[PDB]
Symmetry: D2
Subunit: 416 residues, 4 copies
Amino acid sequence: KSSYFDLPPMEMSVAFPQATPASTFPPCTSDYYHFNDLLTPEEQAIRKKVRECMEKEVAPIMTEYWEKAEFPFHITPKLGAMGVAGGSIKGYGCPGLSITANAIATAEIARVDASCSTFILVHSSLGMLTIALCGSEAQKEKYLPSLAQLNTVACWALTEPDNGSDASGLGTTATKVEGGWKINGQKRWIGNSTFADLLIIFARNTTTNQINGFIVKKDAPGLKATKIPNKIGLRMVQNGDILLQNVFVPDEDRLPGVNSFQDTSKVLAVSRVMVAWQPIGISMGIYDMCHRYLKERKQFGAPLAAFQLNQQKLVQMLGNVQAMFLMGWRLCKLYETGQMTPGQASLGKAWISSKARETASLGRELLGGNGILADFLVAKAFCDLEPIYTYEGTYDINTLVTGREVTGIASFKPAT
Amino acid sequence: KSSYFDLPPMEMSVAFPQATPASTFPPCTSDYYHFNDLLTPEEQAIRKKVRECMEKEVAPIMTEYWEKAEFPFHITPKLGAMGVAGGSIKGYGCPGLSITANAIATAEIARVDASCSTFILVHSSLGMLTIALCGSEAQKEKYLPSLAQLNTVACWALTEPDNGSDASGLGTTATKVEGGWKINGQKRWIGNSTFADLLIIFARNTTTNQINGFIVKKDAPGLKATKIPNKIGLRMVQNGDILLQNVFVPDEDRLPGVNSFQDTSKVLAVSRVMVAWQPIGISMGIYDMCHRYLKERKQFGAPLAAFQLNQQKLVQMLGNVQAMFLMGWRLCKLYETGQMTPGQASLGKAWISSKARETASLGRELLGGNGILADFLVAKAFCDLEPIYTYEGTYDINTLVTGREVTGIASFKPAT
Amino acid sequence: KSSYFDLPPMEMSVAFPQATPASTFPPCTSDYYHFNDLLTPEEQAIRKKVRECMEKEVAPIMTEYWEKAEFPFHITPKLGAMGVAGGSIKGYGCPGLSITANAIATAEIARVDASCSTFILVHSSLGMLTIALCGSEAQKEKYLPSLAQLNTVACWALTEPDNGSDASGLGTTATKVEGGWKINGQKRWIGNSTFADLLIIFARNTTTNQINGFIVKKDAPGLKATKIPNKIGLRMVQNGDILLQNVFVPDEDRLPGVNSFQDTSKVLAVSRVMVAWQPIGISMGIYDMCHRYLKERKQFGAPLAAFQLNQQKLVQMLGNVQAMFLMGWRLCKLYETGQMTPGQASLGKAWISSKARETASLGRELLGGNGILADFLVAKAFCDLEPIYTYEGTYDINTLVTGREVTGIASFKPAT
Amino acid sequence: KSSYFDLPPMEMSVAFPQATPASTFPPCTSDYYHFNDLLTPEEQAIRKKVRECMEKEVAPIMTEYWEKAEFPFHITPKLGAMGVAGGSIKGYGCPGLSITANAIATAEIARVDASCSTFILVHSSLGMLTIALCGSEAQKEKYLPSLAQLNTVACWALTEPDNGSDASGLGTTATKVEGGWKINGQKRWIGNSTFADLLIIFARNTTTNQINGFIVKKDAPGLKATKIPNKIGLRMVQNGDILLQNVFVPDEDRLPGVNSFQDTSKVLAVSRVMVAWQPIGISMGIYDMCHRYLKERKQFGAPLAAFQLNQQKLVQMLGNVQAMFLMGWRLCKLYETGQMTPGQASLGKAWISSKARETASLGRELLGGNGILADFLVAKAFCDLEPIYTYEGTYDINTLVTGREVTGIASFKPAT
Ligand SMILES: Cc1cc2nc3c(=O)[nH]c(=O)nc-3n(C[C@H](O)[C@H](O)[C@H](O)COP(=O)(O)OP(=O)(O)OC[C@H]3O[C@@H](n4cnc5c(N)ncnc54)[C@H](O)[C@@H]3O)c2cc1C
Ligand SMILES: Cc1cc2nc3c(=O)[nH]c(=O)nc-3n(C[C@H](O)[C@H](O)[C@H](O)COP(=O)(O)OP(=O)(O)OC[C@H]3O[C@@H](n4cnc5c(N)ncnc54)[C@H](O)[C@@H]3O)c2cc1C
Ligand SMILES: Cc1cc2nc3c(=O)[nH]c(=O)nc-3n(C[C@H](O)[C@H](O)[C@H](O)COP(=O)(O)OP(=O)(O)OC[C@H]3O[C@@H](n4cnc5c(N)ncnc54)[C@H](O)[C@@H]3O)c2cc1C
Ligand SMILES: Cc1cc2nc3c(=O)[nH]c(=O)nc-3n(C[C@H](O)[C@H](O)[C@H](O)COP(=O)(O)OP(=O)(O)OC[C@H]3O[C@@H](n4cnc5c(N)ncnc54)[C@H](O)[C@@H]3O)c2cc1C
């Protein structure tokens, strides 16, 4: 204890005057290859709209809510006001955007905050889309409209403690009963699960021994989703462990499209493209912050940006960014032309996430001390990126998916 | 909100049964080149003692206190029971260890927790040692005995918001008054400062225009140290912003050894060696955890350690570790023989911290999902390492110190 | 000596049957993101034409001539038959291609052989273009037609032993005499110089103290260009040391466009873009070879492409390639739109050359033993790439050019 | 053709005066951690002796013979005068050195030239040692004395075109005949084979279906060893393809120790340690050259060693070197204490060779243009290192050997 131990933290205005925190978000200096040429007039407008609605409403409060690992619920309606939820889904009260537009949207969110980016992505590109492609016409018209407006929040539940990367061999059972199903099993890592209204839980149809999709409602008897604590990244994203004991799902709430796991590998085709755009966004932000910081912070009687070592670090980031964008952009134009294959998308996410790590690592050390402060974005984004490298297919798995497709030989399984 | 939103987190026994958390700390499988051969019988005994007293008393509680960013005060006496505080200092109620022993001690702490390692290092190798080398015989006999037993905690205050890497050009003034001094200025990043009894504050002697050392007592009128929040690493270490308004320091509490900043560069010679040993420790822990995890966690019907990609990652870590140790060991044997130069020590810290990052980065991705959980050590240590890469001389500064010494040409300042 | 010491090398058919050498060049499996979409119908046709005319006429003989470090002169007319020399130059008997087309042309040459790529690039993009932009209408109509058909070969002479990266401070003097000039000085590294008909030598106009361009004819009295030996890369490219003792250049053969070094920085704008495309080409070839080799060579009772470690290496190359291409492609579309700046082009070359090294390094180790054989392309290209990383602006210089432009602060000069 | 095309290359004194070539070899500035402390008085004397006898007799001529890919036979007796051949072998006219001494000897050779280092290593650590451990007392007393003096040269023949990394499944047959054996099969990559007096050829004992060792004499009827051309590294090392048609080996010339391939894995235990020391040596040389070059070559009105970017590159090399040495040193002290295991040695070679590549890559780019010239060592050593990364167990194989030992699970074979 001390007479000054209880006193509130020093204001950033007094504690470190030389540099401007992320509270007032940096200008877009990462767009060095003038990317608006690769975007359509409408895509450009969505890009600008999201960017502004993020620097205004999320940028100030994000620093506080990340430390507390609490979700900023009062921001939800502001995100549904951007018109991004639903994204790729056409009709059913959804914006109906192009894959390039829905991707550049994700970017300009992850740029300011990766946490709020994953929240929407899991809800929109995994939750909503699964209903939009595998659901029935009765389900699409029922749920989607409210989900696109963010009045109701959905979550995607494929992963288990026992089965992660080997997702196709999951152990949650879906026993057929009169009038519906009884879902029994456990889930781990599901974002939004602790507060989600709709829980798209994947389970094993005990009759067919195949994987089926189920829309599980909130608070449903036998369902218990508890918060996963102590995350170093994506701290605002409420990830949880789901328990399922005789959870009833009526025949009307089973997804008719999912009848094996191969059916899921059409939703993932969009999901993998969209996740691939998160690092593209994050890295841009990391640069934008570094560019300003190195120009504001003075040491040895000169801005940091004047020193050879710092410049080489900055341009390596700038170079990594330009390539990462073009990579993700091309990936979209492959999906749009309808000639995109699992391997191309798996290469996309893997490569981009890898260079994003390098870019984040350089950015983090460039700010030195304040490089470990979430006040200055880079530190938060450095941490925020680590799960992204792993989730939606770990680097190693993706590189092996692209491996299998190109070589023609599968090398996933062990020897034995 | 939800009926299950408020419910406590799922126990690790139920949430993820396949793997054992850091609560029960991993066995020492990182010692692959059998390092006990490089240590003396007495050094070996200190190594073992600390390791055990860390896996017992810190290992269980560390996960909880890291998330809360709170210091575990009830552990303090247990650390002072290890007989590590003081370390290199001979006499004055200190253990009187060899530089190799005091280094291997730091390692086996940082191995289990980097936070508690920095706490002691700043207290012992920076605080206590400054008094031991630059203090008067009257000061050494007065403070050191209590500081070695951890009844009183000391902190080192050189860095400022305006002056960080350019430490020799600091702006905290030490105006001479009748009977003592009036310290005026600001400090940033000082570990333990918020609860430290002794504050070794460096200020500019306004009469000589040189840097002098001052022992500032706790609660002293005009002194205000506030906690720095939102750190991604070393979260338990209470780092703070120090304010100083006409803080009186009597003539008896001025360090007579510090007459310019060059005098400090004899304390730093030990401090830089000791910090260099933190990554060596941390990385060993990161390995020990990975080795078990890859052997416990099963996927695709085999332990993770069976897959080619995972093995190459693991052995790269094992290789990085063996070299890091030998590097730090040699560094000690250079200081011990008395032929160590600033450049050698600067190369030591820089190189080791660099490979520690690589080792931590691999380790973090090896655990996949649980790679972002502080429950599993790696994530915490991954974050914990980032400030260490920067503090006690940033990588770039150190590489330039070694640069200046070898080439003969100084390349720190800008052009202009 | 031995009874078998003098005997000719074993045929590749008997010495290593499992794999096919570069003699029969690999199919295009590096084009994974289907790049023909980014090219125009005419650009596609040039791409195909060059690729075929390289796999037929150069691919067999390249292995032999690289080892001997001799230029394949009997291939010259076959290269001038492709219609690539001149490239960007409109009229004057030149093909008049787009910057994207002239870039994709360079790629499909460097793909098969980097040596023959540099030969043409130095001749066309540096030699011919300098005349086309800085020469007089009388000079353009006189030389260019024959240079485009490869009946006459030109070389570019800016670099000196004393002045390399600091090119603007060169020491070759151009003393004004009656009716012309007397060029005095030394040059180093000039490709084609030993056999070039036209030598575009840059010298210092002693009257204005500025840099001027001079067309020096072959065999001119006082001129002596000797071959530089012992190169590990670009061995077929005849690089030489040029000596100049009172070499007369008539007033008609002075380039009227070059009156300071700033005038050169418009030719370099194309030259830097074109060099940036060499690694893009080379790396594609390196992949194409690896993809086949890993599928042909069998070990442990399976093709190399079946092993996890080898796949991860291959896909990292494939990923590096797709990005490198998009990067160079975008760079062209920046020059084409006329909004390209020195910094963007400097980022292009730097980044691409850097990833090309990584890609080459992986490719070289993938072939193992035969990875050091020029018979198998990769080894040759691995070596061939090293000068490219350095010449046309070293990585460090380029990263500093992009540094200066973005930050606004120049950090080229030393302290002192 | 030209009047100056046939003229001999420009002397290095005139062509590039600013820097000193490798002809006059650089001073030892790579020994930054003062390594003579880790060596015995006798080891120090051997280190110095070899270093001097290399800088005098090999250093001038190496540049010429590397380009021509010819072996400098007139240097052989000078190498046998150093007293290094035999090395570890006790008695039988061999020097009888310690493993640490024989390793530091290899280093100080590979430092000046890697080619001459491999020549001796294959002869001494693979050839001679195989006889010393697996040969009979009659064979040791017969061959070794002459082999240690370098009057006779031996070579090691395990690898085949069909079987490389999978060495234990080789296909050279050893059919038993009256009075001896008939060796039938093919070999590839054998150093010295084209001029070696003794050819230690490994073949499959057709009776036991196991691997046996055979001493095949030079010029033996049915034996034909042809030179392998077009190598980018170790160009002086005469590597060859061996043909064997009914080559008779009398019962007296069969190695009685080699009864299966497991017996070989005691010779390799020394061979792998010794190869591991080649990069340690090479990298030291690469540094020593860079340190001088960056201090001699001036650009922008300052030595290259004055620029931040160049210093960071240089110290990364210096750091990589100090660790590489300690790593190899520790490895020796593990073999010496008799507690070294295949995995430790496999980690040694793998890790060291990996960092040697990094160190060589940096060194090569530091010299810029002259970084591709064998005149300046770095380029030659950069190339020379590439096979070393692969031969004596490729990086991937070694990392998997260390993988198997630590994890307990073997991951060499494919699935299928
Ligand atoms: C958690 C933690 C605990 C700490 N505890 C203490 C403590 O107890 N006591 C104490 O005194 N200090 C402490 N520090 C502060 C630390 O000493 C400083 O952060 C560091 O020494 C200087 O970095 P900076 O924050 O001032 O950033 P800067 O000095 O501004 O450096 C930022 C970046 O600029 C680069 N740079 C700076 N100068 C040059 C140059 N000349 N040439 C090329 N590049 C350059 C650096 O490489 C760095 O990446 C602590 C820091 C941390 C993170
Ligand atoms: C914060 C975050 C949010 C998440 N949100 C969701 C969500 O909303 N919905 C959802 O369904 N999931 C979610 N996940 C879970 C995620 O999908 C899984 O973590 C991941 O797909 C599988 O990793 P794992 O945790 O099971 O570790 P593992 O699958 O056990 O993998 C651990 C390591 O082993 C390696 N490995 C595994 N198999 C092989 C192999 N065959 N060959 C070589 N190496 C192999 C991997 O490379 C990895 O490094 C989230 C995860 C995180 C971190
Ligand atoms: C100049 C030089 C000198 C040599 N001298 C000798 C000599 O004197 N005596 C002698 O006996 N040999 C010698 N060798 C041969 C050497 O031993 C072999 O090259 C090497 O051991 C096997 O490599 P390889 O050429 O057969 O390629 P491969 O064995 O086919 O390997 C190619 C690639 O495949 C990868 N790979 C192979 N198996 C696996 C697997 N199971 N899992 C994952 N990846 C795998 C490797 O990592 C490698 O990158 C020499 C080689 C060179 C280059
Ligand atoms: C095979 C090949 C072909 C070539 N062909 C031609 C040709 O046809 N025409 C022609 O004109 N030239 C040619 N060149 C020469 C080439 O342009 C020069 O090599 C290069 O531009 C300058 O490098 P340098 O050799 O002078 O080394 P240096 O300029 O001395 O550079 C050496 C190192 O110092 C570093 N360095 C230099 N200055 C700085 C600084 N200010 N700050 C930080 N680091 C610095 C660099 O990064 C580099 O690593 C060729 C070179 C090669 C290798």
